[PDB]
Each structure stands twice: as structure tokens, then as C-alpha cells.
Design a protein around this nucleic acid. Structure first.
Ligand code: XG4
Ligand code: K
Ligand code: MN
Ligand code: MN
Length: 328
DNA sequence: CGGCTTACG
DNA sequence: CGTA
DNA sequence: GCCG
């Protein structure tokens, strides 16, 4: 088992679901307390279990696995022996974890904001609604739409959304394309949002595209919120039809020049941990700097041209993983 | 011990 | 600060 | 929290 998540296939569904869930609770709780290193180790240990070919049934099977030390091994041991881990259950029922989880779920609220509200004594969404002076416009939108945004987006929802985005994109710039990215591209059947990547085959024609797209979607009455109600990324709330009604859905739109499209597709397809691990691998093992725009050799001071995700894995000396196997 | 992904709004 |  |  390799140490980096980008060195092994990780399928969406696997054989250690309960074990990985528990470790991810501890990861999430570590992030709520600002311990990014502990969050990373618990996420990586969870991801190792997702990559295993069969269930862990005995503690000895953790021998030699990367990112399993005393703490993660004890969590697994207790789950194997008792079906519950006391530390995990204590986190689950703690007021701090439940409130930080509730608050950071709000669109526009991160750990720092949630933690300040927590320290001020706030605990529920209604507490926030009673103090609208504490809220940015973005947070007001996230709070108002919180119930709809807590409902999973379905794969059936995605196709109808892509068609309306393509229609607006086609009027904004004929020939521009829309690619589904994010978790749905990795094979997920539900999601917290829908992620799209937009480009145009003629380099440079995509400049200034996203404002044109957003103002067309807004004129059609489809945008419940966006930040610009020049930019290349838009995190918005869409109005999506339902039976006899509609529901709010988060949609992320990103524009990239076609020269950068493989890097942007790779970055925005995720998973988040897969990309962190891939960029760490690139820098630490290959001495190359990877981001959503390109791959930089800092010694030659040169960028790698890529025509495909396959190109990028080859540049990094990694076996290619299709999106479905990037579910780290 | 240092390190832990990276850039745009 | 937020977002991905 | 774990790796190198
Ligand atoms: N490098 C990097 N990439 C990131 C980061 N955050 C997001 N991405 C990339 C990788 C992500 O795949 C992509 C957008 O995915 P999401 O919508 O944030 N989540 P997903 O679609 O997996 O699941 P669901 O929506 O159902 O919760 O942006 C980050 O901090 N860093
Ligand atoms: K949030
Ligand atoms: Mn997504
Ligand atoms: Mn997204």
C-alpha cells in the first residue's frame, strides 16, 4: 500500500465503510479545533481503508499500512471489538462538534466564523437569524436556503441543470463547452452541489465569458444568489425545477482556457484529499509545482504542456487513475 | 524536528 | 474572511 | 497524527 492517495485506486464504494466513517468523524473534529495536521492524518488513514481490497477484520491487518499509528489503530481496534469507539461517540454527541458542524454547513460560514459564533454563545440557525447584523449577504443567502441546500442533489437533477447552463453558455459564446466535474464526474449518485468547467477550443476566446454567462442565467430567473448579482469562478445558488415547485441548488461554475483545461479538469474533479495528495506528491517527490492552471518546473522555470489528464499523470510518473478511482 | 495543496471572489 |  |  503506497503512502500517497494518488498512488492507488480509491473507488467510490468499498469494503471498510464503517471504519472510514469513524476516522473521518475524528478528522472533521480536528479541523473544527484548527488541528490541520491531525485532520490530514485521520483523512489519510480513512482513505487507506477505502483503498483496501477487502474488509479489515483483525488488528494485525493494519500492520504495514501507512498513516496507521497508535491512535488510528486504537479507533479501529475498538470498532472491531465493540462496534463503537468511545472517542468517536463522545465527539458525535458533543455540543461543540454538533454546532460547529451545523454552522460550517452554511454557505458563507467557515471554521473561523463558526468558532467565533460558538464562543459568543450561539448554537442554532434561529440564533443566527435573530442576529442578522452578524451576517454577510452571502451568509444571509446560505441561511435562508439552508434547508434546500441540505437536501442531496441527485444525478437526475444534474442533467437538467447542465442543459440550462449549456444554453446560456452557447448564447454567451458559441462553441464554448460545459464539462461536468466534481463528485458526479467521480461517479457519485448524489452531491452537495453540481460543478461545471467551461472552456472554448480557441485559446483566449474564453476571456470574459463567465460574467456573460451569469447575467444570462440571471435574466432567465434561474439564479437565486451569486456574488456579482471580471471573474472566472462563480459559487452560486440555482433555482431548479421540482414537481409542482422548485428547490435551491448550489452550482459551481469555472472557466479555464483550453491550454489549462486538463489541469483544471484534474483539479476540480477531486476528490479534495486526492488533489491535496497529488500536489504534495508532485512537490515533495518530483520537485514540480501543481495547481489548477498548470505544472511548473521551478529549476527550469518552465510549464508542462498537457493535452489530457493522461499527460499529467505521465508527467508525474504516476499510473493513470480514471475519475472513478480518485475517490480518496 | 518540519511538514502537512493551492488559488480565486 | 469566504469559496473550490 | 503520522512520516521521513
Ligand atoms: N486543490 C484543491 N482542490 C479543491 C479544494 N476544494 C475543492 N477542490 C476541488 C476538488 C473538488 O472535487 C472540486 C469541487 O468539489 P466539491 O463540490 O467541493 N465536492 P465534491 O464534488 O467532491 O462532492 P460534493 O459536492 O458532493 O460534496 O474542487 C481545495 O481546497 N484544494
Ligand atoms: K461553509
Ligand atoms: Mn461538488
Ligand atoms: Mn463545488
Amino acid at each position: 500500500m503506497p503512502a500517497y492517495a494518488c498512488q492507488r485506486p480509491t473507488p467510490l464504494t468499498h469494503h471498510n465503510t464503517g471504519l472510514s466513517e469513524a476516522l473521518e468523524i475524528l478528522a472533521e473534529a480536528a479541523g473544527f479545533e484548527g488541528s490541520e495536521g491531525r485532520l490530514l492524518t485521520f483523512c489519510r488513514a480513512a482513505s487507506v481503508l477505502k483503498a483496501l481490497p477487502s474488509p479489515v477484520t483483525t488488528l494485525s491487518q493494519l500492520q504495514g499500512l501507512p498513516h496507521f499509528g497508535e491512535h488510528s489503530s486504537r479507533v479501529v481496534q475498538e470498532l472491531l471489538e465493540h462496534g463503537v469507539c468511545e472517542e468517536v461517540e463522545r465527539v458525535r454527541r458533543s455540543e461543540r462538534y454538533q454546532t460547529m458542524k451545523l454552522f460550517t454547513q452554511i454557505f458563507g460560514v467557515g471554521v473561523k466564523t463558526a468558532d467565533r459564533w460558538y464562543r459568543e454563545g450561539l448554537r442554532t440557525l434561529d440564533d443566527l437569524r435573530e442576529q442578522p447584523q452578524k451576517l454577510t449577504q452571502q451568509q444571509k443567502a446560505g441561511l435562508q436556503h439552508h434547508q434546500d441546500l441540505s437536501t442531496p442533489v441527485l444525478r437526475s437533477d444534474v442533467d437538467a441543470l447542465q442543459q440550462v447552463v449549456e444554453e446560456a453558455v452557447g448564447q454567451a459564446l458559441p462553441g464554448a463547452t460545459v464539462t461536468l466535474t466534481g463528485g458526479f464526474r467521480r461517479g457519485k449518485l448524489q452531491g452537495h452541489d453540481v460543478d461545471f468547467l467551461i472552456t472554448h477550443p480557441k485559446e483566449g476566446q474564453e476571456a470574459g465569458l463567465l460574467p456573460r454567462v451569469m447575467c444570462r442565467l440571471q435574466d432567465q430567473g434561474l439564479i437565486l444568489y451569486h456574488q456579482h448579482q471580471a471573474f472566472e469562478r462563480s459559487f452560486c445558488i440555482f433555482r431548479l425545477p421540482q414537481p409542482g415547485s422548485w428547490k435551491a441548488v448550489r452550482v459551481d461554475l469555472v472557466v479555464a482556457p483550453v491550454s489549462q483545461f486538463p489541469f483544471a479538469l484534474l483539479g476540480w474533479t477531486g476528490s479534495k484529499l486526492f488533489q491535496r495528495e497529488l500536489r504534495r506528491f508532485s512537490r515533495k517527490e518530483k520537485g514540480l509545482w501543481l495547481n489548477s492552471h498548470g505544472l511548473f518546473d521551478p529549476e527550469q522555470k518552465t510549464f508542462f504542456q498537457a493535452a489530457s489528464e493522461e499527460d499529467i499523470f505521465r508527467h508525474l510518473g504516476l499510473e493513470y487513475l480514471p475519475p472513478e478511482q480518485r475517490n480518496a
